[PDB]
Amino acid sequence: EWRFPKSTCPGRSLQKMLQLNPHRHATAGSQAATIPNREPFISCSQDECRLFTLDHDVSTPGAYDGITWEDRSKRRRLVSFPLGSELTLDNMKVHLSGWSGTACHDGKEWTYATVNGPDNSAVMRLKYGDQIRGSFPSYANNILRTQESECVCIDGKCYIIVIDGPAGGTATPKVLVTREGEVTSEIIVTGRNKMGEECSCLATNRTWIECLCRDNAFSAKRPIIRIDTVAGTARGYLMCSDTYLDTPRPADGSITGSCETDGTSGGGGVKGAFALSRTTEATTERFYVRTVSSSARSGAVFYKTTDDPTESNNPLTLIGTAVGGAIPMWYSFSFEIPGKVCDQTCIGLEMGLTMGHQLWTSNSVAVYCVIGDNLDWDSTTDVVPADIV
Amino acid sequence: EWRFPKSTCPGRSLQKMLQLNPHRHATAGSQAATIPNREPFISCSQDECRLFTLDHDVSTPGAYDGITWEDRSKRRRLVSFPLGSELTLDNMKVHLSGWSGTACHDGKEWTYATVNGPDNSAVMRLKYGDQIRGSFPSYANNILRTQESECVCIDGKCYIIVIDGPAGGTATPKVLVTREGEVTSEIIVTGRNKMGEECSCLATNRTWIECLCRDNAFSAKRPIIRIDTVAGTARGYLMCSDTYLDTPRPADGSITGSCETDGTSGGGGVKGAFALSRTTEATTERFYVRTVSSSARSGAVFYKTTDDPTESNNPLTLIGTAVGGAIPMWYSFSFEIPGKVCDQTCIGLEMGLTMGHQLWTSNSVAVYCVIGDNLDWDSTTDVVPADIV
Amino acid sequence: EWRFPKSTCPGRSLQKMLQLNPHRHATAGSQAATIPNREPFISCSQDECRLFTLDHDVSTPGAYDGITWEDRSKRRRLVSFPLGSELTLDNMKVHLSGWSGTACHDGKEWTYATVNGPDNSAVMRLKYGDQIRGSFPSYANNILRTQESECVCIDGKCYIIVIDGPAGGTATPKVLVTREGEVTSEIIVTGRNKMGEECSCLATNRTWIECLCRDNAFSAKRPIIRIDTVAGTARGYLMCSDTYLDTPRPADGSITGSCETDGTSGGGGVKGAFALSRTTEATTERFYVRTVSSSARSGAVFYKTTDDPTESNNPLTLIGTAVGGAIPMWYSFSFEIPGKVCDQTCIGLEMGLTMGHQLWTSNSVAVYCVIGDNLDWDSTTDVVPADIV
Amino acid sequence: EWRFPKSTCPGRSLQKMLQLNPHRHATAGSQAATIPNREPFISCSQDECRLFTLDHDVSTPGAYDGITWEDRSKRRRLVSFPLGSELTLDNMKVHLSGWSGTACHDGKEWTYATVNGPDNSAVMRLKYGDQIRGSFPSYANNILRTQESECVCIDGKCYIIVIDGPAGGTATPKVLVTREGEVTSEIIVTGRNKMGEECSCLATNRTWIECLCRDNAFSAKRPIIRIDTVAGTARGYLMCSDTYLDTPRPADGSITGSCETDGTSGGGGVKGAFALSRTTEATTERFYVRTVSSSARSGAVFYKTTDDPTESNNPLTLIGTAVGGAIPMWYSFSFEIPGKVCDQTCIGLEMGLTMGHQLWTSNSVAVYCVIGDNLDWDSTTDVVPADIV
Numbered sequence A, B, C, D: 001e002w003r004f005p006k007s008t009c010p011g012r013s014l015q016k017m018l019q020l021n022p023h024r025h026a027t028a029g030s031q032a033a034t035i036p037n038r039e040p041f042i043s044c045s046q047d048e049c050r051l052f053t054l055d056h057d058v059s060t061p062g063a064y065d066g067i068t069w070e071d072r073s074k075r076r077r078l079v080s081f082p083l084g085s086e087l088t089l090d091n092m093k094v095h096l097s098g099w100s101g102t103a104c105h106d107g108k109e110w111t112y113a114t115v116n117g118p119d120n121s122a123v124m125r126l127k128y129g130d131q132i133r134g135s136f137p138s139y140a141n142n143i144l145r146t147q148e149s150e151c152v153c154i155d156g157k158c159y160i161i162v163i164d165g166p167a168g169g170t171a172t173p174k175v176l177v178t179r180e181g182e183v184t185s186e187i188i189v190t191g192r193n194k195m196g197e198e199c200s201c202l203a204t205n206r207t208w209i210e211c212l213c214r215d216n217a218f219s220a221k222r223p224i225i226r227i228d229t230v231a232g233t234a235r236g237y238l239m240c241s242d243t244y245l246d247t248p249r250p251a252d253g254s255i256t257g258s259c260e261t262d263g264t265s266g267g268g269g270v271k272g273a274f275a276l277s278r279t280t281e282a283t284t285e286r287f288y289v290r291t292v293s294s295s296a297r298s299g300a301v302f303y304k305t306t307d308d309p310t311e312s313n314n315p316l317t318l319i320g321t322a323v324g325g326a327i328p329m330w331y332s333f334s335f336e337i338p339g340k341v342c343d344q345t346c347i348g349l350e351m352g353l354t355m356g357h358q359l360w361t362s363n364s365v366a367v368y369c370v371i372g373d374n375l376d377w378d379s380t381t382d383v384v385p386a387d388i389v
C-alpha cells in the first residue's frame, strides 16, 4: 500500500546509470524542440521514475529562449518527463506553474508542489494526482521556496522542507507534513536552524529522514536536518566533516571551532546532495558530492563515510572525480528508487550549460547510484553553448 | 461506478494550477508544430484530465494557418490533449469533426459531442467511447450550437445544453439528456429562457446542476439555468448581482429594475465561467470571473459570493485580478476535477492571441482552481503575435 | 472473450465522425514529418480503433517522397496510428513489410497480414500479436493480394479474402480462415467467382459475412461474396442494382440482362465499400458509396437500400453527396466499431492527393458511420498538392 | 510467471517481418530528428518487443552527429524503441550509459546491462526494472564487453556472455548468471574457449542455451557456446560446417583438419546470428546467416541445417539471398518472440549506412523470422548516405 523505506540494495560506491543531454539536439541543422530548464531532479513511484525540472515555457531553438537564466517568473512551471525520455517538447508534461518545486510519490499518487506568486507574497500549492489539495502561503514574505529535489513520503504522509526569508541572512526552514497533498501539520526545526535552503532528503531508516541543505549566508558547512516522523520532530545540525561540501568554501579543515561553528566566510552556496546505504534500523554508509573547485561551480567529486556526519570532523573518504574540474557542475540532488525487494539511493548532477550572464541557460543531467565497489567513469557534456542555435 | 457529485475539497479562493502556451514555441527558429485553436475547455475522468479544443486542421507555423479566425468550417474538429501535454501535432487526438463542442466522462466512458454541417441544417453527433451513439438535428435551422465547455454527468446520464436560433435575438436553449451518448430525452428550459449561449455548468449538489451562460442579445446580466436531474426539469434565471459578468456591460448596478430586467444595452457577449464550493446538499460559495474592461475582452478579475445569484442584487466580493487589463482574455470555462475523496471546481481562461481581424488566431490557457484563501498570482502570455512565424 | 457480431446501434443514415488530413501540415514553414500513404483503412478492437495504411518508408516533406505513387516495392509497410492521432512519423507503428494489407482483432489479439515479395512469387505473412504465425504463398504467381480493408473475426477465427492472377482477367478469390494467425483452412468461392479484388467485408448477422468487391476486368457491377462461417462455405454474386457502384461505369440501368450479366464495358475499377444495419439474425438495411463521376475517381455519393443486393435490380435510394464531384475520391473501405452493447458500421473515404502521374501521392481520410436520419455534411480536403513542400 | 523456452511455432524457412529505416527521414527538407546508432538488437517480453541499440547522444541531421563512427565513448547509451516505432528522438527511451549492451526479460522485469568506463577498467552495470542491481568489473582490463544482442532468461535467472581481453588474441568469455539483475554466479566456459565475441544466444530446449559467436583472432569458423542451466556448466565449440559463417573467410571447406582446427587466416570478424526450431527436448533445425562477400561486410545469405553444428562438417543448405551483395550488411542478431502457445526465433540484420572512414555511421534494421517454406523477398535500404543532411 503506502511507500515506506526498505533496506537498500547492496552497494559500496557510486556508478553511472544514465545521462540526459537534450541540447545535444539543439545545434545547427537539428530538428528537435528541446526544453531548456534548471533545478532538475528525479522522483520515482513503484511504476516509473520521472525527471522533474523547472522550465521557462519555451523550447530551444526559439526566439524566446533568452529568458532561461531567470530564477523566478510567470513563465516557469514544474514539468516532468519519463526517466529516459529526452527533454523535448512532445515528451514534456506540465504539472504546476511556479518557480521552486518538489514532488514525491506516496505509493498511491504523486504529490507535486511549487511556489508561485510575487517574491513578497508567494504561495505554495500542492497537487495530489490531478487536484490542488494544499495551499501554504509565505510566512516571511521573502521568496517562499522549497527543495528543488524530491520530498519523502512514509506511511501515507509526505515531508517537504520549505524556507522563507532573506537568502543572505537568517531564514528559518519548516517541515510541512502533507496527506493527500493537504498540509496537515508544520514541524518546527529546532537546534541549528538559522538556514537550510534546497534540502536533499532521504530516509535513514524505517521512520527517520535526513536532509542535506545549503546555508546560503553563514557557513561552507552544509546544514543537516533530521526528521523523526513518528515523534513529529525535526532538528537542525551543521555537517561536521573537515571535507566541507558547499561552494565556495575555504580549505578543508580550516574552520576553527566546534562542529556547529560557522566559520568566517560562508556567503553564497549551491544545492548539494548525498546518497546512503541503510537497514531498516540505521544508515550504514553515506556518499557525498562536492565540486572540484572550492570557488566555482565546476566539477563533481564523490566521497563516502561511515561516520555520523553531525558528530565527526573526520575527512570524508575519496571515491573519485565524477565530473572533471573544467566542466560546469551546478546543483546536485538526492533521490531514491523504490523496489519490490530493496530500495536504492542515487545522486543526480546538473551539468550546467550557459552562454553567460543573463543569457541562455540550461543543463545536462547525469545520474549515479549506490552500487559496486568503485566509481566506473566520469561524465562530460560535449555541448558547446556557442553551438546552440 | 457512475460519476456523481461529491462535496468539494476545502478552499476559499482561486489559485493558479498551470498554464499551456503552445505558441511560445512558434517563433523564428523553433522546431514545433503547434496547434492553433479556439474555444478550449477541460474535462476530467477519474483517470485523467484532458484539454479539449476546436482546431482548424492545421499547425503553426504553416501556410494554411490563416483560417484560424473562422468560427465554423469543414476543417474544424473537437480535439484533445492530456492535460499538461503541450498543444503540438503529435500530442493531439482528434475526436469528431465539427465547429461547436462539449465532452464529459460519466465514470465509464467519454461522451464527446460536436455540431457539424451547414448553418441552416447542422447536426450534433454524440460519440460514446469509439462509437457515434447519438444524433440530434437542428430544430431552429440557425447554427445549432453547444457549450464550448464540459457537460455534466450524474448517475449514468449526461446533461448537455444546446441552443439554436438567431445569435442576435430570441433563441431557446434545450437540455439534452444522454445515456451512453444516445439522446434519451430533452428537458424544456422554463422561466427566463429566451437566450443562453455557451453555458458553463457545474453540479451544485448531489442532484442539481447550475449553468452560467451568455445572453448574446438582451442583457449584460448572465443567464443562469438550473437543472433538477431527479425531477428532469430545468428553469432559466437572470443573474441578479449588480456586478454584471458579461462583456460589454454598463457600469455596475446601473441596470434599473428587477433581477430579470434585461437592461437597455446587452447586444454581444462572451462565454463566462464560475466555480463553487458545495456539500452533498447545497452550494456554499460561488466564484466568478469577468473581464477587467467593460467594453473589450481584456483582463480577468475574480469575485466570490455566498448569496444565491438568482435572488440577490448584492455586489460580488472582489478576489483580485487574474489577468491584467492590457492582456486579451476571451472565453472562460468551468470544469470539475473528480476525486476519490472530494471534487474540485476550476476556471480556465482563454488568453487570446491574434494578429487581427480575419488573421491568425489562437490562445494560451490558464487554469485556476478553488483552494487557499487568496489569489496567488496573475497570468501573462509573453507571446507577441507579430513574432509568430 | 471472442469477438462476434452483435446487433447494430440504431441508425438510418450516414453522418460524419472525423477526418484525418496529415498533409495539411506539409506546407511551407510547417514543422511536421507527415506520412504519405495509400490504401488506408480502419479496424478496431474493444479497446481502440486504429487507422491502418500502406506507407513508403518516407515522410513528407523529404527528398525520397517521390516514390509514393508506386503500388508495390520493397519500401512499403503496413503501418497504423491510433484513430484520431495525426499521421506523423512519431505516431506511426510499423507492423509488417509488404504492399497489400489487412488486419482485424479477434477479441484477444490483432491479426495483421501483408503480401510481400516479387510479383510472380509473393507471400502473405500473418502476424498474431508480435509473432508471425501464418504464411500463405502465391497460388497463381501473379500479384497475390488482399483486401486493403479490415478482415472479419467471429468466434476466434478470422476470415481474409485474397486473390491472385491477372488484374485484367479471370482471377479466383479465396477465403483464408485463420486462427491465431495460422491459416487453418481455405474456403473455395463458388458461384460468380471469376473476380473479386479488394473486398470490404462486414458481418450480416451472427454467423455470416458479406463482402463488396471490385471486378477489375468484366463488369461495372460489384461482386458480392457471402461467407457462411458455420458451414465453412462461400459463394460469389454480382450486385444486381441498376445503381452500379464501380468506376468507370455505364449509365444506371443500362446493362441489359440478368443480375449476373457482366455488361459490355467493365475494365478497370476502384475499391468500394458499404455499411449496414443488422440484428443477430438478419441485415435490415445497407448503405453504399460510389463516386460522383461515372468515369473518374471523383466525388462520393451515399445510397441505401432494404433490398437483397444479390437479387433486386431496383435503384438504390439517394442519401446524398459526401464528397463534391470536383474533389478526388479514390478507395473507400468498410469497418465496424465493436461495442459493449451494440456494434456500429462505417465507411471511410480515401480522398486522394497527388501531384500527378508518377509524382507524390497520398490522401486524407474521412469517416462516416451509420447513425441519424440524414447526411449531415460533405467533406473537403483544402489541400492543394502544389503547396506540398 | 517466469519466462522459459517453449516449443517453437511451426516454420521451415525465414520470411520478412518488417524493417526500420529511420534515416530515410534524414534527407533535405525532412522534419525528423532521427537517431543514428550501431549494434542494434531486439528483445521481447510477453507484452511487447523492443528495438535496443547503442546511440551517440545526438540526432541526425545535427552538427554533432559526426562522432557516430566511434565504438566507445562517454556519449553512447543503451536506448530502445517499441518495436515498430521509428527511431526518432521522441520515441527513444534511454536505459543506461555505456558502449556495449545486452537486455532480456525474465517474465517479470527487464534486465538491461551495459559496459561503461575506460578501456582498461570498464564496469558492467545491470539494471533490473528501474534499479541498478548488478555490477561486474573488468577482469582482464582490456575492453570488458558483451553480446550486442539479447541475453536469455530461464526460470528467473538470466544468462549473459561477457568477454575481456585483446580483441586480436586469446580472450576468455564468461557466462554471468543474474537474478533480478544481481550477478549471482559466473560459469566458466570450458573446451574451445580462447575467444567468443558478441554471442547471439537462443534456448535450444527447456534448459539449454546455444550461443553463436565471433572469433576475432583465430578462425573464420564461429565459436559456439552451449550452456546447461540446470548443471550450471558451459562448453565452447567451433562450428564445424564447411560453410564458414564469419567475414572475412576462406573458400568453403578449405580449412584442413578437425572441426576445432582454426585454419590459417581468421583475423577480424563480424557478429553473426542464427535462428532455430525446437521442441521442449531438442532443437530440430537451425537457420544461419552470413555475408554474400567472403571479404567484405556486404550482403546476407540464409542457410539451414538439421545437423549438429558442433559435429558435422556438411555444407549448410542454401535458403537464399536476404540482402543483395552490393548492399552493406554488418552485424546480425538472434532474438526470440515469446508466445502464449509457442515461441518464435528470428534474425535481425544491421544494414549499415555510412559516409566513410571516421564519418557519419548508422543503419537500417531488417527482421526475418522462422515461418513458411521459402524466403519471400530480399531487403534494400534505398538510402544513399550522400543524401543525408
Ligand SMILES: CCC(CC)[C@H](NC(C)=O)[C@@H]1[C@H](O)[C@@H](C(=O)O)C[C@H]1NC(=N)N
Binding pocket: A039, A054, A070, A071, A072, A099, A100, A101, A143, A145, A146, A148, A167, A197, A216, A269, A270
Ligand atoms: C533567492 C534564493 C535562491 C535559493 C538559495 C534561489 N531560489 C529561488 C526559488 O529563486 C536559487 C538561486 O538564486 C539560484 C542558484 O543559486 O543557482 C537558483 C535559484 N532557484 C530557482 N530559480 N528555483
Ligand SMILES: CCC(CC)[C@H](NC(C)=O)[C@@H]1[C@H](O)[C@@H](C(=O)O)C[C@H]1NC(=N)N
Binding pocket: B039, B054, B070, B071, B072, B099, B100, B101, B143, B145, B146, B148, B167, B197, B216, B269, B270
Ligand atoms: C454565432 C453564434 C456564436 C455563439 C454566441 C459563435 N458560435 C458558433 C458555434 O459559431 C461564437 C462567437 O461568434 C465567437 C466569439 O464570440 O468569440 C466564437 C464562436 N464559437 C465557435 N466558433 N465555436
Ligand SMILES: CCC(CC)[C@H](NC(C)=O)[C@@H]1[C@H](O)[C@@H](C(=O)O)C[C@H]1NC(=N)N
Binding pocket: C039, C054, C070, C071, C072, C099, C100, C101, C143, C145, C146, C148, C167, C197, C216, C269, C270
Ligand atoms: C495490380 C492489382 C491492383 C488491384 C486491383 C493493385 N493492387 C496491388 C496490390 O498492387 C491496386 C491498383 O493498381 C491501385 C488502384 O487501383 O488504385 C492500387 C493498388 N493497390 C496497392 N498498391 N496495394
Ligand SMILES: CCC(CC)[C@H](NC(C)=O)[C@@H]1[C@H](O)[C@@H](C(=O)O)C[C@H]1NC(=N)N
Binding pocket: D039, D054, D070, D071, D072, D099, D100, D101, D143, D145, D146, D148, D167, D197, D216, D269, D270
Ligand atoms: C574492440 C572489440 C570489438 C568487438 C570484437 C568492438 N567492441 C567494442 C565494445 O568496442 C566492436 C568492433 O570494433 C566493431 C565492429 O567490428 O563492427 C563494433 C564494436 N562494438 C561496439 N562499438 N559496441
Ligand SMILES: *[C@@H]1O[C@H](CO)[C@@H](O)[C@H](O)[C@H]1NC(C)=O
Binding pocket: A204, A205, A206, A207, A208, A280, A281, A282
Ligand atoms: C531510526 O533511527 C533513529 C535515530 O537513530 C532511531 O531513534 C529510531 O528508533 C530508528 N528507527 C527504527 C525503526 O529503528
Ligand SMILES: *[C@@H]1O[C@H](CO)[C@@H](O)[C@H](O)[C@H]1NC(C)=O
Binding pocket: B204, B205, B206, B207, B208, B280, B281, B282
Ligand atoms: C439540491 O438542491 C436542490 C435545490 O436547492 C434541492 O431541491 C435538492 O433537494 C438538493 N439535493 C440534495 C440531494 O440535497
Ligand SMILES: *[C@@H]1O[C@H](CO)[C@@H](O)[C@H](O)[C@H]1NC(C)=O
Binding pocket: C204, C205, C206, C207, C208, C280, C281, C282
Ligand atoms: C444469418 O443469415 C444466413 C443467411 O440469411 C442464415 O442462413 C443464418 O441462419 C443466419 N444466422 C443466424 C444466427 O440467424
Ligand SMILES: *[C@@H]1O[C@H](CO)[C@@H](O)[C@H](O)[C@H]1NC(C)=O
Binding pocket: D204, D205, D206, D207, D208, D280, D281, D282
Ligand atoms: C536439452 O538438451 C540437452 C543436450 O542435448 C540435454 O542434455 C537435456 O536433457 C535437454 N533438456 C530437456 C528438458 O530435454
Ligand SMILES: [Ca+2]
Binding pocket: A214, A215, A216, A217, A218, A219, A220, A221, A246, A247, A248, A266, A267, A268, A269, A270
Ligand atoms: Ca555556504
Ligand SMILES: [Ca+2]
Binding pocket: B214, B215, B216, B217, B218, B219, B220, B221, B246, B247, B248, B266, B267, B268, B269, B270
Ligand atoms: Ca450580453
Ligand SMILES: [Ca+2]
Binding pocket: C214, C215, C216, C217, C218, C219, C220, C221, C246, C247, C248, C266, C267, C268, C269, C270
Ligand atoms: Ca469494374
Ligand SMILES: [Ca+2]
Binding pocket: D214, D215, D216, D217, D218, D219, D220, D221, D246, D247, D248, D266, D267, D268, D269, D270
Ligand atoms: Ca574471424
